[PDB]
Design a protein around this ligand. Structure first.
Ligand SMILES: [Mg+2]
Lengths: 469, 372
DNA sequence: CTAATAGATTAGAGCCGTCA
RNA sequence: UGACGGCUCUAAUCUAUUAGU
């Protein structure tokens, strides 16, 4: 008979040096780490986008209720939970003429009108940022739904501007990298979710029970993009530096141009936990292969180590590299070339797709989350998704597929690696959640990859995650 | 002394927690979960150590407050500020403020019946245990005695080409019908290798590599699984990269096997549970059975619209729970069992590979109380 | 270099659900 | 692109065998 072990709860630190396990109530009862002053917002778009954004900012400061409060916590207001006022008074509105909008949705080609839209938004943003006496905190982007809906990559409307990407968000985020402006991209469908209906009398998707998490998620992401931190960890020990690595492909190009991006947990000596993406995209000319060349991987690891040392003062003993693919011999040689003298390296491979479904004998609820099945000394299943005793509900719907955490190379302890991986599932600032089904060290790198893919000429890339998330 | 006396449940919760957080003592019924001395204490507090106070019951409380007074002779931020100003102006006493008490009360009250129970549990799995293997791995030297386009996968016995050999678990003189020139075969030129050393990892030879040998054996296992599924009058679906084997309609007894429903009807359309065989030798020999749901029109002919397949699968998978997945998997596995405890894969005239019908059982240490 | 048979690995688009 | 998960189809790429010179 085979045995199962349990991994202790990670817990997360909050204001006043308190501790808890759930991020939402850790913020609600105790507050965020720092204290902000205010947030200033500016809408780019039509007057309709202005109206929608003002309505959303008025709704965020007010209490939000659902049918049953057991499933999700309620929203009491952004200022009350973050201790900083942010409403529709510190606003800078930039018009977008409908006449200019109409003149671009006519070429029937996605490339030209997409590039024209990106330019017509970025020029207004830069003009407002430069030639105005106000100082907006976070620049907000509102996009009409139908125009982008017709801007799909493999779609048509029923050469200077033709050799570019066929997507809006990616190129738009890639073109604001050299300006270092915190820009947040909203589709009109998200915020104006109440003014869109159908000819049936009932919504297609039941959004009446996810309003609270929508509000929490957008508020946390915005507050992060304002320069504040909602929470951090309680037991980040010295010698810990998590580093991510995700692969992406550029699709429409002469060469396959495999795109690999990195993200990095580490300490900033301010008694906090600062997440910055020390990422400048590394290109793999070979087709189909998902292995960095020695040069690019060596550069990635050297940049991570230098960032840590210049951030803290000494090279950490241990480095964790969470990857979605396995490693080769020369790649590990490249990572070992810049490894400090008295240090060791661990590479965790997380193969998401593997068939293993477990059944409880009596109950219809799935396996408990923090369970761990030790196949061997260098292999284990960790149910990053599972039943949560804190909220008594199920994170996933169907039977979860446990992640296959393999210590691909190096020597470590399976218990410690699994505990650290479980801990890293709460440090996202996009959505204020309980725990993530995938480590954020393997997801924020992917979001970086999808952001900084549409263009490759950018020099001096942004560091913080306010820009990309 | 030193104490101060269902539509707004969370509002009251947050208000009380915040008032405690700023150092204002709040007494409420949400502290003591147990009920049944519940009113006498309140009356004693009102009569003895109550100085200032901040439906039939509401009327009675209002009357009590009036008697006490006679005897004495937008947003929530504005409300919170007004409450704080009123408390400060009235000079309501307070002690040293701390959040440790609030954290402890939250830990010991909010998540009382949501804790960890140290109880061992047993879980099933989708891995079918493998019992035994035939005594040898057979390689047949079929030199210039078979057609070059003979298409080895058309045979009734599982075999796959390798260099100039043929690998199978059958005798050297099987399937002579499809390959007529078989009789003049010398038996001393057939390579036999025992399964134990090659599978456990004790076979290093130039003829075949261990990873290659494992790939060959799992190919034979998948091919024989396909042949067995064809043998049991079970239709097939050619998936995106693999093959799935789905029972027909009316094959079972009242569409039920061992008190389990595997094929059924949805609206005016028929759905069919299916399985996919993929044997792997890591960590230990198993015969993985992934689960799928396909939809057809009349129950026998597949529908040629992948979008319809995905939409129907996602619509059906919303209502499925752990019990249903377990029951369907175990019933489908038991339906292919032979006699009592295992079903063989017909990989030979008299030689078979035994794979047990009971999936591997996992044992745990910590359980979850599943409180209804 | 080029075309068939398997396994094992990888990404990418497109769609569905959140109540009870 | 407010999030997450579970999926379908989808091709590409590595290894071994075979046949096109
Ligand atoms: Mg972003």
């Amino acid at each position: 008979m085979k045995e199962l072990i349990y991994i202790e709860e990670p817990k997360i630190l909050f204001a006043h040096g308190q501790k808890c396990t759930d991020a939402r109530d850790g913020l609600a009862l105790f507050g965020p780490l720092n204290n902000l002053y205010g947030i200033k917002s500016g809408v780019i778009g039509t007057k309709q986008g202005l109206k929608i954004f003002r309505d959303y900012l008025d709704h965020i400061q007010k209490p939000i209720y659902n049918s049953n409060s057991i499933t999700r916590p309620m929203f009491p207001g952004f200022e009350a939970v973050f201790d900083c006022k942010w409403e529709s008074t510190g606003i800078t509105f930039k018009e977008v003429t409908n006449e200019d909008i109409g003149k671009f949705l006519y070429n029937s080609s996605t490339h030209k009108r997409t590039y024209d839209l990106v330019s017509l938004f970025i020029d207004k943003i830069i003009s407002a940022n430069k030639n105005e006496d106000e100082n907006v905190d976070v620049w907000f982007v509102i996009v009409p739904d139908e125009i982008y809906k017709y801007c799909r990559p493999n779609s048509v409307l029923p050469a200077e501007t033709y050799n570019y990407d066929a997507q809006f968000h990616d190129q738009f985020k890639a073109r604001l990298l050299k300006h270092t402006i915190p820009t947040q991209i909203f589709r009109e469908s998200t915020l104006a979710w109440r003014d869109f209906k159908n000819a049936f009398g009932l919504p297609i998707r039941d959004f009446s029970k996810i309003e609270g998490h929508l509000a929490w998620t957008i508020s946390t992401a915005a507050f992060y993009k304002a320069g504040g931190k909602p929470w951090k960890l309680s037991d980040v020990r010295n010698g810990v530096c998590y580093l991510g690595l995700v692969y992406k492909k550029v699709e429409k190009s002469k060469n396959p141009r495999n795109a690999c991006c990195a993200a990095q947990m580490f300490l900033d000596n301010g008694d906090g936990t600062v997440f910055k993406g020390e990422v400048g995209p590394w290109y793999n000319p070979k087709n189909g292969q998902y292995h960095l060349e020695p040069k690019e991987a060596k550069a990635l690891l050297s940049q991570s180590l230098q960032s840590y040392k210049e951030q803290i003062g000494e090279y950490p003993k241990e480095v964790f590299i969470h990857a979605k693919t396995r490693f080769n011999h020369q790649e590990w040689d490249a990572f070992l070339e810049v490894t400090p003298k008295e240090t060791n390296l661990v590479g965790v491979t997380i193969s998401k797709t593997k068939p293993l479904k477990l059944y409880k004998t009596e109950g219809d609820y799935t396996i408990l989350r923090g369970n761990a099945y030790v196949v061997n000394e260098r292999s284990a299943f960790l149910w990053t998704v599972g039943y949560v005793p804190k909220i008594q509900t199920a994170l996933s719907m169907e039977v979860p597929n446990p992640l296959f955490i393999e210590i691909n190379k190096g020597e470590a302890d399976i218990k410690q690696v699994l505990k650290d991986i479980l801990s890293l599932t709460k440090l996202n600032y996009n959505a204020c959640i309980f725990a993530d089904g995938e480590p954020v060290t393997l997801r924020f790198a992917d979001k970086i990859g999808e952001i900084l893919t549409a263009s490759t000429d950018i020099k001096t890339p942004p560091l913080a995650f306010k820009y990309y998330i | 002394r030193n104490k101060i006396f269902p539509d707004d449940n969370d509002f009251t919760r947050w208000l009380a927690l915040k008032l405690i957080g700023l150092g204002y003592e709040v007494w409420c019924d949400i502290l003591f979960l147990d009920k049944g001395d519940f009113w006498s204490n309140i009356e004693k507090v009102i009569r003895e150590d109550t100085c200032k106070f901040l439906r039939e019951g509401v009327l009675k409380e209002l009357a009590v407050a009036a008697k006490v007074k006679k005897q004495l002779k937008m947003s929530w931020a504005r409300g919170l500020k007004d409450i704080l100003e009123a408390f400060e102006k009235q000079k309501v006493p307070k002690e040293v403020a701390d959040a440790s008490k609030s954290n402890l009360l939250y830990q010991q009250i909010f998540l009382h019946d949501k804790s960890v129970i140290e109880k061992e549990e047993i879980y099933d799995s989708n891995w079918l245990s493998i019992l035994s293997f035939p005594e040898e791995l057979r390689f047949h030297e079929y030199n210039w005695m078979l057609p070059k386009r003979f298409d080895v996968r058309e045979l009734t016995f599982p075999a796959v080409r390798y260099k100039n050999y043929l690998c199978t678990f059958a005798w050297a003189y099987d399937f002579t019908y499809h390959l007529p020139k078989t009789e003049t075969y010398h038996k001393s030129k057939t390579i036999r290798i025992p399964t134990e050393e090659i599978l456990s990892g004790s076979y290093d030879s130039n003829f075949i590599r261990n990873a290659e040998c494992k790939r060959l054996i799992v190919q034979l296992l998948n091919k024989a699984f396909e042949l067995r599924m064809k043998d049991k009058e079970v239709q097939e679906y050619e998936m995106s990269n693999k093959t799935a084997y789905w029972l027909e309609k009316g094959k079972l007894e009242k569409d039920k096997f061992e008190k389990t429903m595997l094929v059924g009807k949805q609206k005016d359309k028929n759905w069919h549970f299916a399985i996919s065989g993929a044997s792997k030798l890591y960590p230990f020999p198993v015969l993985m059975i992934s689960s799928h749901i396909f939809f057809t029109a009349d129950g026998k002919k597949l529908i040629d619209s992948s979008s319809v397949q995905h939409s129907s699968r996602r619509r059906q998978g919303k209502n499925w729970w752990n019990n249903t997945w377990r029951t369907k998997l175990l019933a489908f596995i038991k339906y292919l069992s032979d006699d009592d405890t295992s079903f063989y894969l017909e990989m030979g005239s008299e030689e078979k590979v035994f794979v047990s019908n009971e999936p591997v059982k996992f044992k745990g240490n910590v359980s979850y109380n599943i409180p209804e």
